[PDB]
Amino acid sequence: ENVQEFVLKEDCELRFAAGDDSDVCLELVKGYAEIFGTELLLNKKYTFPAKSRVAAFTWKGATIELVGTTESAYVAESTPMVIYLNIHAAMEEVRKKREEQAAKAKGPRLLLVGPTDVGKTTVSRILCNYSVRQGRTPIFVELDVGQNSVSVPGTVAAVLVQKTADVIDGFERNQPIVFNFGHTSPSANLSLYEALFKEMATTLNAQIQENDEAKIGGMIINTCGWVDGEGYKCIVKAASAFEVDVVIVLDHERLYSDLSKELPEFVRLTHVPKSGGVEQRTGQIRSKMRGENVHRYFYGTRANNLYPFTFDVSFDDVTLCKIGHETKLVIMEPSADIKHHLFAFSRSTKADENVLKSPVFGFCLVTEVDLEKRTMSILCPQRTIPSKVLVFSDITHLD
Ligand SMILES: Nc1ncnc2c1ncn2[C@@H]1O[C@H](COP(=O)(O)OP(=O)(O)OP(=O)(O)O)[C@@H](O)[C@H]1O
Ligand SMILES: [Mn+2]
């Protein structure tokens, strides 16, 4: 196999993209390095799948080996990494101050805002990892219903972060709090989207009353890239509902300017540039990555393989339901049009008013529809159905 060697001076990062066909294996052979906030272990082999875009950053200097065919591979001497460090350090200062005034202390809450392709997910991951490396357990909140690092597309989700992200796999799905939105864009149902992140905020505020570490750990909140029109109001409303102390704007000066004049005076507002290592995505890439996200939910990853079950379910044993006048509940009759659609197992025992704002156990995929036998084949993470109430999602997946 073809080998590439890289010498990284202090405060430099190796930016590489895996080829379209082949895996790239990374090894740190000298010094200290990190990938999006997670420390790399010396001489450990990290295998990245095809089309992976990765930055390995070093604070003090590193030598890194790459094995395999790369699409691109170069060392960048200029990064916004110290900015993220200073943001983290400022949050930890707020923690210390509030801990010394409680005799429980509530952790600082940060809102990340900006358009698509600015590295918002990457920055959230770094900030969470740094909090973990400080000894904290932050709550990571994902409001982006298009691309979700916690659950499937069409979800508003949150996880308690107790360990640094796996270099390849990201953060562990340690009992996630997931709400089903059922659309890739908030513009499909604006009143429901607002209701869901307000419910998320209310849920978490009550959860942290039972957990001191989660409370002081604070919140890092990722938004969708919709900054124009009604999307701007969602940002202001998310900031209010989550009672954020800090708003970080990535690469959008007009949004920064507008938020500085509307947000309460106590809210610290920081504009940061996007990393030069962020590549812009097209519609095809996002659609492919959404499909890859669904596939990861059921089947897992290379390192952590999940084994989903494929079993038949009678329509008499389940209740199919759809949301959408906008927040109105609709009972679904078994049809051919439910094929390839995702369905959420609601935590509500009855298909009624409670379904709208209830979290979900998880998701299944309807693969086959047997209208003659009155059964449907579903791909499900567990052996039996966790709920009899199945909530419709407009997200389709071909498997
Ligand atoms: N400094 C960097 N060097 C190299 N690659 C990077 C860097 N930062 C981010 N990337 C890569 O760019 C891609 C997009 O990053 P990320 O998902 O954080 O952007 P985003 O704006 O949150 O995405 P979206 O546009 O879907 O909202 C990812 O594959 C990530 O690995
Ligand atoms: Mn993102």
Side-chain angles (χ1 to χ4, degrees), residues 79-280:
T79 78
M81 286 297 298
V82 77
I83 295 158
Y84 314 138
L85 175 63
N86 293 2
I87 289 162
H88 155 73
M91 283 185 78
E92 181 55 36
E93 289 170 38
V94 177
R95 289 193 186 101
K96 295 269 172 54
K97 279 196 180 189
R98 290 184 186 178
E99 281 174 318
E100 290 161 49
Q101 290 195 245
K104 293 293 184 75
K106 186 166 81 181
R109 301 184 190 179
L110 186 149
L111 187 70
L112 273 156
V113 303
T116 60
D117 304 326
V118 293
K120 210 131 58 72
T121 294
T122 296
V123 177
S124 64
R125 184 169 167 179
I126 294 162
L127 296 176
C128 286
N129 282 329
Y130 282 14
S131 287
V132 171
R133 287 166 70 174
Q134 191 72 62
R136 307 296 187 172
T137 58
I139 302 164
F140 174 54
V141 188
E142 183 78 69
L143 305 182
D144 191 358
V145 290
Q147 301 278 325
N148 207 302
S149 57
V150 169
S151 190
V152 295
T155 62
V156 172
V159 187
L160 177 64
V161 189
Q162 297 182 234
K163 291 175 183 185
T164 52
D166 186 82
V167 175
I168 294 93
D169 295 350
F171 297 108
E172 288 185 344
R173 283 92 193 270
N174 175 250
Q175 295 188 334
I177 297 163
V178 184
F179 291 92
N180 182 42
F181 181 59
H183 307 284
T184 58
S185 176
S187 57
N189 199 330
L190 197 71
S191 60
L192 174 66
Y193 184 70
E194 287 178 18
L196 284 176
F197 73 65
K198 282 175 186 174
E199 196 66 31
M200 173 62 80
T202 306
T203 303
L204 293 170
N205 283 346
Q207 292 277 317
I208 60 165
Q209 295 297 303
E210 296 168 315
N211 196 297
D212 294 329
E213 282 72 59
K215 191 178 188 180
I216 192 58
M219 294 184 190
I220 291 152
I221 309 152
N222 189 22
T223 53
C224 70
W226 186 29
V227 299
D228 296 316
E230 303 156 333
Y232 175 80
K233 267 199 173 174
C234 292
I235 288 164
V236 180
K237 282 180 176 290
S240 180
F242 285 94
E243 290 164 309
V244 303
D245 302 282
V246 187
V247 176
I248 312 291
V249 183
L250 274 61
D251 186 49
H252 209 295
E253 300 206 329
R254 193 202 72 213
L255 182 72
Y256 173 77
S257 176
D258 284 3
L259 285 165
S260 69
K261 298 176 184 184
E262 196 171 336
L263 292 165
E265 52 186 318
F266 82 94
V267 181
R268 185 177 170 169
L269 183 72
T270 310
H271 193 263
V272 305
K274 72 177 178 196
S275 174
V278 188
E279 160 78 59
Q280 56 180 133

